[PDB]
């Protein structure tokens, strides 16, 4: 676990060694755009922007990727809602409940699942405004996700319109699924088969399925 | 069925209307390289290069794709061996035999199966030399396979090394699986569950299964 310093808040970024190859470019890129980010109140707060860089990558086989943090109360862990109030994670838990038979739970967290790294393409938004920092994270977003696709077997992105151009953006050889976002119109998410498809493709790729029930909190 | 003219042999390419949108570009790319390509004796003969363009695409939900034709005796139909002598198709048949329970058969052809189009990424080779014509087919190969992946639900490529970067070339929402080639050492093809898993993937995509037993000749 090393760290590097950046000129603007949060001033230091702690990271796992698996990220070493991109940290130099990340410092340079972040120093360029950070003033744009910090003039607004943000979700998450700046000290939590990069908290997922503490996660290893070599033991990951699925990236679960949303476009950017919750408009409010983002923790720096994508989808995480400590009090289980956010619609997105509740919808995800409901789907996993249906697939796993786990009916009694108090919460759900993608970040405690073996082999899964939850990710947000953009690492912040202006408080209460989705995708408001897209232009500023852009170069960093491509850099960091491309780095993740060097490790994982499956990239699962949520939001058909949000991720409309993801394949041209990454130019990756990795398996990529773009599914419905939890708030997609007409409850399309609950019929989405992506969690099942991911496991079929992993086992095809000679990897263990994801045990999605590990995400539950009791 | 319409046809177009090319400047060198086979001179006329007849095609089903489903291929209409790539034909002008095909003519242009083929005219650019045919003079160099036709320095060699080929598998298949030039009059059979394009015979699969006679197939419709709108009723196809799976493409089974090899790298290029048999080094000798290619017929223009990928994997096809009229006398059932070639190793690849014998291994394919054996795999489908175990999957289906069909024990007595005299041959197997991937081209007589409802919903399947068998394909070769490169449409010829120099006689007796595998992948020898990749230099000539390059642009055509991308053009044609990309068009197929706008119609099929699953793309099944044979050759882990040959197709390792294929999802970056296609940049497609199609579900692409890359499996072992029939002649993979330590008999890895025999362990491969791709043919079986194709129907699982199709079901998740709300499509009908393939009846792989239609491929048998008796
Ligand atoms: O972190 C989050 C939360 C909701 N939606 C996302 O895309 N990411
Ligand atoms: O047509 C063929 C024959 C052998 N191998 C392939 O990949 N395709
Ligand atoms: Cl969506
Ligand atoms: Cl063979
Ligand atoms: Cl192989
Ligand atoms: K969001
Ligand atoms: K071949």
Residue numbers in the entry:
A (entry chain F), B (entry chain A): 1 to 218
Please give the exact wording used by the authors of the publication that reports this structure.
The crystal structure of the uracil complex of Vaccinia virus uracil DNA glycosylase (D4) was determined at 2.03 Å resolution. One uracil molecule was located in the active-site pocket in each of the 12 noncrystallographic symmetry-related D4 subunits. The structure of the D4 molecules in the complex is nearly identical to the structure of the free enzyme described previously. The uracil ring in D4 is positioned nearly perpendicular to the aromatic ring of Tyr70, with the C5 atom of uracil at a distance of less than 4.0 Å from all atoms of the tyrosine ring. The OD1 and ND2 atoms of the side chain of Asn120 show hydrogen bonds to the N3 and O4 atoms of uracil. The O2 and O4 atoms of uracil form hydrogen bonds to the peptide N atoms of Ile67 and Phe79. As noticed in E. coli and human UNG, a conserved water molecule is observed at a distance of 2.9–3.2 Å from the O4 atom of uracil. However, the position of the side chain of His181 varies in different subunits. As a result of this movement, the distance between the NE2 atom of His181 and the O2 atom of uracil varies from 2.8 to 4.8 Å in different subunits. Nevertheless, the structure of the complex presented here reveals that despite the differences in the characteristic motifs, the architecture of the uracil-binding pocket and the interactions of the amino-acid residues with uracil are conserved in D4.
